[PDB]
Amino acid sequence: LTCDQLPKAAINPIQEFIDSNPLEFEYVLTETFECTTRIYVQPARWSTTKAPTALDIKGTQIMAYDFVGGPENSAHLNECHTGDKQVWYFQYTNLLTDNGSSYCAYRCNGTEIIEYKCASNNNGTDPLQHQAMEVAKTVPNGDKIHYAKSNCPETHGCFAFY
Amino acid sequence: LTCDQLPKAAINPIQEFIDSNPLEFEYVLTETFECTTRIYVQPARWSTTKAPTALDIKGTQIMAYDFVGGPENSAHLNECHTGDKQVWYFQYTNLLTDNGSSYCAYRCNGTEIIEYKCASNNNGTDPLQHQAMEVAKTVPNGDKIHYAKSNCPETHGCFAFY
Numbered sequence A, B: 001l002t003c004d005q006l007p008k009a010a011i012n013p014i015q016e017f018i019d020s021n022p023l024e025f026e027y028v029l030t031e032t033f034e035c036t037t038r039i040y041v042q043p044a045r046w047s048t049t050k051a052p053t054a055l056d057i058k059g060t061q062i063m064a065y066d067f068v069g070g071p072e073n074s075a076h077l078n079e080c081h082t083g084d085k086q087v088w089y090f091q092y093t094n095l096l097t098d099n100g101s102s103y104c105a106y107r108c109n110g111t112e113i114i115e116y117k118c119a120s121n122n123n124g125t126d127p128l129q130h131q132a133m134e135v136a137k138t139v140p141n142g143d144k145i146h147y148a149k150s151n152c153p154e155t156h157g158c159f160a161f162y
């Protein structure tokens, strides 16, 4: 199996993601998105693209990306500080269940995987999530995929921020 | 007029704030919240306080505060990185109108004002907002209140983030 052959799952309407806030990552590829919270935001009233935004928040640092739909269930992200483009797909989503929400998303470079983000608001207890992670690790460079919360900083009274 | 005598307006239910996302500050007191976007987040499924969170996002930096209600329409904030406490009130709110949402909030130390945050998603066009700012500037230390967006960094394709 190669990264281009992974499933490209249907994307839930944006409000379903917003209603899942806040999420934390359970499995990631590089160190970048360890100990990170995901927040979805609807488009600004003054946005001329009317693209929603994904926020990746790691302590007191934040990466924001406006995103729009592309072909074959892709998300086309524009990183808001640089204007750099990223193309993402979902292996699966399972939002707004009786046990909360999860999904696994990935970014390829051709046949290899270069980033991975499995998110949930149920502490990774959706059996689909572990299952998806085990499939993603089988594509080239998927050996890097690892648990995202092994050594996160101590909290100071909040639950999704530190 | 002193800061303790400013109005302490009714607080809209949290979902009305969430539905106003994203907001930007129009008037602030210190330099801290210049060029800053406000995002409200519902409590995490795993939060034992079930407090919502306010996010103040300034470029790639973020301050998060879980907050709960206190006496006399106060918001009691817990800054998520330090555990430091802040007590806030609203001069007014005007959320989810046909021209969007605005509010002005403040933080006193006794008779003086120490921080001010007027937010909107309509570029400060709610006449209540300019009016509230003109009242707040009359309390001790209100002379510091100023326009929040005079010199913000260039955007790179997004609208509420940079």
Ligand SMILES: *[C@@H]1O[C@H](CO)[C@@H](O)[C@H](O)[C@H]1NC(C)=O
Residues within 6 Å of the ligand: A109, A110
């Ligand atoms: C994929 O890798 C190649 C080789 O380094 C690079 O030129 C390209 O920009 C990368 N990203 C893609 C195709 O999104």
Ligand SMILES: *[C@@H]1O[C@H](CO)[C@@H](O)[C@H](O)[C@H]1NC(C)=O
Residues within 6 Å of the ligand: A123, B046
């Ligand atoms: C979340 O899952 C991790 C890993 O299994 C575990 O160590 C932790 O106790 C869980 N947290 C809760 C609140 O159940």
Ligand SMILES: *[C@@H]1O[C@H](CO)[C@@H](O)[C@H](O)[C@H]1NC(C)=O
Residues within 6 Å of the ligand: B109, B110
């Ligand atoms: C108000 O100012 C006094 C004097 O510096 C300080 O001790 C106190 O902690 C400040 N903050 C309050 C009352 O919230």
Ligand SMILES: *[C@@H]1O[C@H](CO)[C@@H](O)[C@H](O)[C@H]1NC(C)=O
Residues within 6 Å of the ligand: A046, B123
């Ligand atoms: C927002 O208001 C400022 C100050 O009046 C103005 O310079 C700017 O052009 C306004 N933006 C829009 C999109 O109307």
